[PDB]
Amino acid sequence: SIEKKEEVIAHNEVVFRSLTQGLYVKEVDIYSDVVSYTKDVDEALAMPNTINFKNSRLIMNLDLEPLNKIQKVIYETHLEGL
Amino acid sequence: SIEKKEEVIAHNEVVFRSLTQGLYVKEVDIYSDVVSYTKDVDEALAMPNTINFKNSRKYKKLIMNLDLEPLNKIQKVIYETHLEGL
Amino acid sequence: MIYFVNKDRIKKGIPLYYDVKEITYIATQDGTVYEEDYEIKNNRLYLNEKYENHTVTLKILMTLRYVVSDILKESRYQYTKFNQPKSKFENLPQKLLLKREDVIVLQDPYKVNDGIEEDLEIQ
Amino acid sequence: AITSVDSYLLSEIKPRLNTVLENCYIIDEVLKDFDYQTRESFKEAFCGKNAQHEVTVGFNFPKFKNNYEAHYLIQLGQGQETKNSLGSIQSSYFEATGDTLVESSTAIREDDKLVFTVSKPIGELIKVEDIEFAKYDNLQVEGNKVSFKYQTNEDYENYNANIIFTEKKNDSKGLVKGFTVEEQVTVVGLSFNVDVARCLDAVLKMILISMRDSIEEQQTFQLQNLSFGDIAPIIEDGDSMIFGRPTIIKYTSSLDLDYTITQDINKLTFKERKD
Amino acid sequence: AITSVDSYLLSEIKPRLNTVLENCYIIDEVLKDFDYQTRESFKEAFCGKNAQHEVTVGFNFPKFKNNYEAHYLIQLGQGQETKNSLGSIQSSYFEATGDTLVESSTAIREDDKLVFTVSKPIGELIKVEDIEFAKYDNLQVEGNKVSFKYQTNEDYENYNANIIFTEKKNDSKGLVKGFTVEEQVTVVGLSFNVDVARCLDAVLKMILISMRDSIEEQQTFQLQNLSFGDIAPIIEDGDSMIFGRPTIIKYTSSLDLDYTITQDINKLTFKERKD
Numbered sequence: 001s002i003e004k005k006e007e008v009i010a011h012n013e014v015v016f017r018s019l020t021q022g023l024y025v026k027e028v029d030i031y032s033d034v035v036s037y038t039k040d041v042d043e044a045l046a047m048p049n050t051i052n053f054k055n056s057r058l059i060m061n062l063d064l065e066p067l068n069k070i071q072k073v074i075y076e077t078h079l080e081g082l
Numbered sequence: 083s084i085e086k087k088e089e090v091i092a093h094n095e096v097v098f099r100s101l102t103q104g105l106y107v108k109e110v111d112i113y114s115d116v117v118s119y120t121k122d123v124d125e126a127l128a129m130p131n132t133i134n135f136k137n138s139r140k141y142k143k144l145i146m147n148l149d150l151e152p153l154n155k156i157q158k159v160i161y162e163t164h165l166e167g168l
Numbered sequence: 169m170i171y172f173v174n175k176d177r178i179k180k181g182i183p184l185y186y187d188v189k190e191i192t193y194i195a196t197q198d199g200t201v202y203e204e205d206y207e208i209k210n211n212r213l214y215l216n217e218k219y220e221n222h223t224v225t226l227k228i229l230m231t232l233r234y235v236v237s238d239i240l241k242e243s244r245y246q247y248t249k250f251n252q253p254k255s256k257f258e259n260l261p262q263k264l265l266l267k268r269e270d271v272i273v274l275q276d277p278y279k280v281n282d283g284i285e286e287d288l289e290i291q
Numbered sequence: 292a293i294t295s296v297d298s299y300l301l302s303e304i305k306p307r308l309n310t311v312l313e314n315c316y317i318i319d320e321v322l323k324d325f326d327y328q329t330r331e332s333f334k335e336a337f338c339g340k341n342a343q344h345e346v347t348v349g350f351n352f353p354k355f356k357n358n359y360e361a362h363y364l365i366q367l368g369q370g371q372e373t374k375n376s377l378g379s380i381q382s383s384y385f386e387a388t389g390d391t392l393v394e395s396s397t398a399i400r401e402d403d404k405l406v407f408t409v410s411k412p413i414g415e416l417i418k419v420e421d422i423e424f425a426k427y428d429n430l431q432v433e434g435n436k437v438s439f440k441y442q443t444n445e446d447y448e449n450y451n452a453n454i455i456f457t458e459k460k461n462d463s464k465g466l467v468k469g470f471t472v473e474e475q476v477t478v479v480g481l482s483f484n485v486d487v488a489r490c491l492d493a494v495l496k497m498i499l500i501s502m503r504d505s506i507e508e509q510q511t512f513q514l515q516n517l518s519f520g521d522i523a524p525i526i527e528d529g530d531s532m533i534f535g536r537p538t539i540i541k542y543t544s545s546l547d548l549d550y551t552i553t554q555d556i557n558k559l560t561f562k563e564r565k566d
Numbered sequence: 567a568i569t570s571v572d573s574y575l576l577s578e579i580k581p582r583l584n585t586v587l588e589n590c591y592i593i594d595e596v597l598k599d600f601d602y603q604t605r606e607s608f609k610e611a612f613c614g615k616n617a618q619h620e621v622t623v624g625f626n627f628p629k630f631k632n633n634y635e636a637h638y639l640i641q642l643g644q645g646q647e648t649k650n651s652l653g654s655i656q657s658s659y660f661e662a663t664g665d666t667l668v669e670s671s672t673a674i675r676e677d678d679k680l681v682f683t684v685s686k687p688i689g690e691l692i693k694v695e696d697i698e699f700a701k702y703d704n705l706q707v708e709g710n711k712v713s714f715k716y717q718t719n720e721d722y723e724n725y726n727a728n729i730i731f732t733e734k735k736n737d738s739k740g741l742v743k744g745f746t747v748e749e750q751v752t753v754v755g756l757s758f759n760v761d762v763a764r765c766l767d768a769v770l771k772m773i774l775i776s777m778r779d780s781i782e783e784q785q786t787f788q789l790q791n792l793s794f795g796d797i798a799p800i801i802e803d804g805d806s807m808i809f810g811r812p813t814i815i816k817y818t819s820s821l822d823l824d825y826t827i828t829q830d831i832n833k834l835t836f837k838e839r840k841d
Contacts, residue, residue: 003123006435008408009397012449015165030737041085041163048451056833065168072162075410079123080154133197133222170355183345185356235530271359271483271529320824324570427839443839485627493568500744500823503654517747519645524627532627536642
């Protein structure tokens with residue numbers, strides 16, 4: 001069973017994804033329009049997921065499928081008997 | 083919505099408990115009989131139990147003591163990636 | 169020889185320092201290994217996921233090989249004339265000082281095979 | 292904190308070297324000055340995720356055969372004591388402290404405070420990225436977590452911050468006794484192909500450059516100096532020679548030990564005398 | 567920009583050596599102090615377009631046989647770190663820049679401006695030969711081409727200019743982290759005839775002198791120093807000895823790496839507080 005546990009959220013971001021190809025964005029141009037795509041889920045271009053940024057610039061393309069990405073990292077211990 | 087999951091083992095070591103007293107061993111004498119005790123898991127006579135260190139010899143006398151209850155203290159870190167839509 | 173496995177080497181395949189003819193004995197921290205868990209292709213070794221972070225060691229048999237590191241008593245000669253229409257020149261055996269191939273290893277040469285069955289009955 | 296330079300070197304080199312060899316853009320940046328032939332050959336052999344050939348690193352005198360296509364060889368080298376302080380005193384601490392850790396931690400809402408959680412307790416908070424807490428925010432650390440006033444900062448409820456902090460070990464206090472040591476460590480690349488050795492040396496130089504931003508050697512192993520030897524045949528008795536160019540790395544570190552103190556004053560006995 | 571001194575030496579030596587040996591006038595200028603016999607023998611053997619004998623240059627430890635009539639042999643030698651800057655900072659750049667290029671470019675007429683075309687885009691314009699543009703000319707660079715006002719300069723519609731410029735790579739910005747390295751490289755001429763070796767050494771010295779005007783070592787490999795060894799028999803086990811006089815060349819270069827920065831400020835949030 002569990003003797004001690006704690007959960008923390010290492011990162012919380014918004015990932016951009018194409019609607020047709022299904023590949024996420026990797027690299028972008030000066031205006032941040034897409035120039036490269038990638039199949040990876042983590043390497044994809046992402047921005048902080050907070051309202052201030054959202055109000056501070058969706059804006060690049062009509063492929064309007066952002067993805068709120070949240071990373072949960074958990075520390076725990078067990079005392080398994082014999 | 084767990085997009086991906088991963089697990090990691092940081093430590094894996096054995097710790098002994100007295101069946102009646104409920105304490106954990108911390109020290110032994112030259113004959114390897116218990117000398118001291120603690121009620122703290124973080125401070126105990128840890129025996130490494132990773133892949134390389136199995137089948138030890140330092141604590142054979144300690145193991146055979148019926149009053150002691152071995153415990154496999156294992157510490158883990160698990161990473162979970164969530165995709166929550168827009 | 170011995171190798172250390174990681175999450176990357178498991179998929180690519182372990183590159184062996186030597187060549188391979190056959191394997192004598194494999195082992196790891198969990199004990200020996202059976203034929204059902206490992207395979208070899210193009211002189212590299214594959215393992216299943218059970219040994220992601222284990223060590224592996226092998227006793228291996230390889231073909232003997234040599235390179236000519238010097239030519240010694242290099243030429244010996246005879247004007248053979250007895251029982252010949254005319255004088256003939258014949259080069260007698262060279263002596264070679266051979267050296268083993270350890271630092272760099274190349275696979276056995278690709279010889280062209282013959283379709284003649286060995287130990288073929290005739291009648 | 293006794294320093295093992297070789298283990299630190301190995302731990303820094305392995306993941307960093309793998310990451311550098313992972314992608315082609317960084318390698319092309321590194322090998323800008325080299326000719327087309329050697330650059331492309333090295334890229335074909337070692338560079339890329341799907342590379343068939345692979346480099347290795349390890350210490351000297353291994354009982355097993357070691358791959359001589361491309362390998363990083365380390366040996367410990369000499370050392371010297373250069374500077375000392377009065378009484379060998381380096382620093383004084385009230386709370387036992389271990390390594391310095393960097394952790395990412397997303398902001399969280401608590402009924403009175405925004406907070407960040409951490410893996411382990413805090414002995415001292417060095418820096419929070421892009422934040423300079425004022426008196427109004429009333430920055431407070433309470434074991435595992437650090438906290439600041441909720442109301443006036445409520446726009447930042449999910450701030451994707453990261454933290455540089457220090458572990459907490461005990462509440463005891465003591466003195467740090469030790470000195471500084473000037474150490475030399477030798478690193479050499481091995482390859483039966485000389486061009487591969489040259490490229491390997493260049494990669495080694497680049498990763499040494501990159502390491503200077505690392506926390507540990509910023510805090511522990513300052514004053515890095517480098518020195519390169521001549522390309523020489525390491526071995527001639529094989530069918531083909533081994534070629535390598537040794538490099539010498541210098542570091543300065545503080546070997547020290549924590550001397551605890553049990554004396555704690557809590558009362559005073561001011562009394563006069565009579566005659 | 568990691569520096570490969572050996573490759574630069576080879577690339578500078580080969581065409582320059584061929585050009586020097588092409589004509590007799592330069593060779594006669596070089597060998598003014600030598601006697602008639604050796605001078606004329608070397609000229610007969612190697613000098614001239616139609617020379618039957620030819621010199622060669624290459625690195626050390628070649629697995630193939632190497633011509634020992636006249637050859638330039640290079641080996642890498644030692645290296646040392648001599649100077650550093652605070653934080654290992656060398657320079658700061660707003661736009662990624664590659665090598666410095668020199669291109670000839672004849673002037674062209676455009677409806678409002680005279681212009682010069684170039685092979686590649688421009689990151690920065692250093693100099694235009696024999697020109698000091700004033701405010702009236704309003705010098706502007708727009709990617710590949712540089713331009714100035716047409717009307718008052720119309721006499722120069724076909725000016726046979728040449729340009730020293732710098733390549734453009736990216737619009738990103740970053741920091742340059744690195745140090746200076748003091749490197750030694752050894753060069754030796756080989757010949758079974760000692761007089762040929764002497765003349766070869768003199769030619770080597772002259773081309774080293776000529777190299778100092780080169781762009782690359784003016785920008786990268788400053789502080790050239792030379793040192794000559796004694797004429798010695800390189801090998802005695804052959805039917806005839808090999809004679810060569812090693813020379814040591816020193817250079818100073820800046821090993822550096824570009825550290826990019828993603829932080830760009832474009833908005834300000836100046837707000838007061840209340841209590």
